[PDB]
């Protein structure tokens, strides 16, 4: 049974890395990408922390697991993923894997340990369950100070970007690396197969890095994209509301937005260092050659595209797209340009590890694509499905279907749907939902979405068929 | 022999405005009904939101049982209609031979009264298709952006808050609803079947829109603002700060704007007092009044700047939670009831009057014993009311409140901050005492009372409550 290592990162965009022709030199990630299978059109399930992680680790959509919002935050109803959901963690433990977990969990206090893992170190490790939702009174005060024209140390805005004191060695990231090194050292001492997860809070906003990462990218040299610095025209109302207090970006200057990029880029450089330290330890311990590796970001993050920061209830590519590398040491490297989903991770682990089934797989194993390339799916529709059921206690019910040339977003809590022509408008600036020139494409996408909601037994199909009755 | 029933239902009508409650508006027709009937002077709504309160009124069950726990048809609620599995008192009355008629605001799903057997004579929902998209307030958003830039609408008004309508009373939706109600009463007098009429007015809801003379009847310059007007909210839950509906941004409101919101609302109350008189005079002219069993109720109150809030939202303040309620049984002597009653008590009261068949649980109680005996019917019983605020237009909050005459405890499970108000010493609910160790005995009492109530109604939030309140259980 093969050794598996997952390197999971929070709110890491698909596009930043040098292997994607992005602005940050990421030699260690690029080397893993070129040794493994690049999923260059990977899509998350939801641009939100807990839902994306539950889908990743269970292999089922939120309507089946119940984990359809963030946990532990104003004003979500949810505290934890049900312990009835053992996830790949309990399934691997059941067949004799030593499972270990380091870092960000965000699926309920103690959750990895309750499912049989060694939860070595992380925020959720010694927390009591059923805590009250964290309510951002301080961030509300801070953003009011920003709107009043105040700034933090050195003119920074610490709800967006911050220079941390000290060095890399003092960071949470370095501690997560060091716990991952200990995990690898301990695994090399056992004959038992191991399944390790190292889950980093970096590079999530607010973008907080020590020197030299804080200053390595000059804000003045940042290239800003075509959808930066735009007013949202004819977009759904949920994109305008201040769900979390830092979504008020009315105080942000162009310099503030540029520093949000430059500090994020420093965080990506720091993550590449962290990946190299773990890969070099895996090599030194003699585990690397047979190590089956997943590197993934749970979703992306908005850096001022459509005038949005962080995440919220919407489907733009900067949030919906995720970086994904799956390295199987038995296979030659390939680049997969067909779309894949976060729902495909658990079936891939299940095939690698011969995990027992614990119910439905709403995705598919990526091994055929890893072995054969895009030709594995020749003749099949190239779609992805995205949901945004909730944002921190706000219900939206959002569903998107994305093809290589178009995206349709159903907003059942609104009157306004979205239709983007990704071939002619890849920056998703122009909502074409009301344009009669796109009636054929809209009709196709509505039918594709109905098929997908039926496939996954989404109970919102009934409302979909009412809203879409003109098709 | 089955009694004729008339319900006069008003949207967002506060408990306190009427002259019979020593309020600032002369309301002689409502006062006369209060003086002839049973005054429920401490009536409480179930939820300060339109569709949940109306579903609880017409079904007699809480929203976790009926499913109707949010507004329907509004950004960004998941709901479109009260399930047709819920016949309500409308289908139950039709099934025993009442001719049921409905006029005006429904807000429980397109065609709903008609689908349940009523003559839906006239109203917004009568000819609407079902399963419509949620109304999303793009224009209100644009309007409030202009207000925040310092703009005003015509004649200095702010039409998301108050507006002088063109024309006369006779041109209004209210007058049309009265004319349909008069036709309903005229037709009822020609039938040998008992009748059940509901006339449900959008007035006096905000934005406060009235024609002359009601628009200028009450001088804004004379308005008395209360002690909790315009204050900075100290140590209150975060949901009271967020701009759920676009007009909740009141940062642009001057004191004069708030006084005009009051004076226009007072005009709307005067206008509905006229409407009530017109319908009561028609019932008298048609020979129906002497035996007519009448309920006058507001679905909830409305905020006029108390705690710096406008309209409604996810919170439990008395100006929203309290509702006006008069129940006139012509066989009984008039009394004033000072013990708390609930919107959940309306359906059981109708059930006793009308001998309605059981269609499931009654989460409230019939008010006939109080109507007959006065407050002493319940001597020895805890005087409590239970309030819920599960959702506000697609925002989940799970709020529960328990109110006694002297205290209120509010559980906000989507927050870390609960509320505790000493209504005896702080009736304006300015000071949140949740963290004050001097109120530990009262907090413990109210947490126990809430635990009893959630258990009684089989609320599935008891699992979470038991965790949040574990220090008290
Ligand atoms: Ca995330
Ligand atoms: Ca109402
Ligand atoms: Cl860090
Ligand atoms: Cl845009
Ligand atoms: Cl295969
Ligand atoms: Cl009117
Ligand atoms: Cl206050
Ligand atoms: Cl009785």
Residue numbers in the entry:
A (entry chain A): 36 to 506
B (entry chain B): 35 to 507
Question: What does the report in the manuscript say about this coordinate set?
Answer:
The polysaccharides in red algae (Rhodophyta) are primarily mixed galactan agars such as agarose and carrageenan. Carrageenans are high molecular weight polymers having a linear backbone of repeating D-galactopyranose units (G) linked together by alternating α-1,3 and β-1,4 linkages. Furthermore, transcriptomics revealed upregulation of the CarPUL during growth on ι-carrageenan, while biochemical analysis of eight CarPUL-encoded enzymes revealed carrageenan-specific activity, thus associating the CarPUL with the ability of these pseudoalteromonads to liberate energy from carrageenan. Detailed analysis of the enzyme activities encoded by the CarPUL, combined with interpretation of growth phenotypes, have allowed us to propose a refined and detailed model of κ- and ι-carrageenan processing by some Pseudoalteromonas species.
We observed conversion of ι-NC2 to a product having a TLC mobility consistent with β-neocarrabiose (β-NC2), most likely indicating desulfation of both monosaccharide residues by the sequential activities of S1_NC and S1_19B. Taken together, these results support assignment of S1_NC as an exo-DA2S carrageenan sulfatase that would likely have activity on any form of carrageenan having a non-reducing end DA2S residue (e.g., ι- or α-carrageenan).
